[PDB]
Design a protein around this ligand. Structure first.
Ligand code: STI
Ligand code: MS7
Length: 264
């Protein structure tokens, strides 16, 4: 548009829509080419929830959060356009990677990048609410960005029903399960599970544990065991993220500083 206004609004026809991304696992999200820049992009298409997501994305900018490039929200069909990340979601990436290439230090790097995005969300007073390897993307040179694919009602037993809502029970903090309280500290809990996913090259958390007994075990102080090869200090960080009282969990500022330190 013309300033004589929303700088994010773009020309629908600047983009050649191609096929639905990841064989339909993200819902209405398409591979596209932003012709003017010769650039492959991801395009989410369709209201209030959709317009609210666009508004949030215009408020966030960080090298490890997926980057909004533009929107088409004047008339339907509405688009939200972001960069395309070459290697796809982190969960699949970890399962399928060359483990000699994706060594302990690369896992350290992925965790540091994600804690950096989370320290930024925290500073900005945002809550992710669904942090997990399936909502992270991998680009070149093991670049990792945090995203939010609205996976609740797309995805098996990863999400399970609660009052109109579906929750990923094995990523969900005890106070979220019991009182529907979500905060940056419930993201800290989820981050601990994400760290376990990273450490195990993408294994499912609480393997074989039925969902109905997760809260009970947590309340009895059960926590997942240290993964083979996970350094003691990284496991100690995981366990701190899984403190029963949310006020006892570290901040993302602290977590990131602890990884930044190890990484350096
Ligand atoms: C095309 C698009 C549209 C919207 C979004 N949105 C987000 O990723 C996102 C990230 C953070 C927030 C912050 N938010 C704070 C408030 N709480 C409640 C929710 C989280 C919101 C949206 C991403 C994308 N990108 C996207 N989506 C699906 C798949 C892919 C993709 C797949 C494969 C390779 N490259 C990219 N890329
Ligand atoms: C001299 N060498 C050293 O000091 C190494 N111990 C440095 C180092 C510290 C932590 C690491 O973490 C691996 C990891 C992180 C996140 C999730 C799973 C695994 C890796 C290397």
């Amino acid at each position: 548009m013309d300033p004589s206004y929303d700088k994010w609004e773009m020309e629908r026809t600047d983009i050649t829509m191609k096929h639905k991304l990841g064989g339909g696992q993200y819902g209405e999200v398409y591979e596209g080419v932003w012709k003017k820049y010769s650039l492959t992009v991801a395009v989410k298409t369709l209201v209030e929830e959709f317009l609210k997501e666009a508004a949030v994305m215009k408020e966030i900018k960080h090298p490890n959060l997926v980057q909004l490039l533009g929107v088409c929200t004047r008339e339907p069909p509405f688009y939200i356009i972001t960069e395309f990340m070459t290697y796809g979601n982190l969960l699949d990436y970890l399962r399928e990677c060359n483990r000699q290439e994706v060594s302990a230090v690369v896992l350290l790097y992925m965790a540091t990048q994600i804690s950096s995005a989370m320290e930024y969300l925290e500073k900005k007073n945002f809550i992710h609410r669904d942090l997990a390897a399936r909502n992270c993307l991998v680009g070149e040179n093991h670049l990792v960005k945090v995203a939010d694919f609205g996976l609740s009602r797309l995805m098996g037993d990863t999400y399970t029903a609660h009052a109109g809502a579906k929750f990923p029970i094995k990523w969900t903090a005890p106070e979220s399960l019991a009182y529907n309280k979500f905060s940056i500290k419930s993201d800290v809990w989820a981050f601990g599970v994400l760290l376990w996913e990273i450490a195990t090259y993408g294994m499912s958390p609480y393997p074989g544990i039925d969902l109905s007994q997760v809260y009970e075990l947590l309340e009895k102080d059960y926590r997942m065991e240290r993964p083979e090869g996970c350094p003691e200090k990284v496991y100690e960080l995981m366990r701190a993220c899984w403190q029963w009282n949310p006020s006892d969990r570290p901040s993302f500022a602290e977590i990131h500083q602890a990884f930044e330190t190890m990484f350096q």
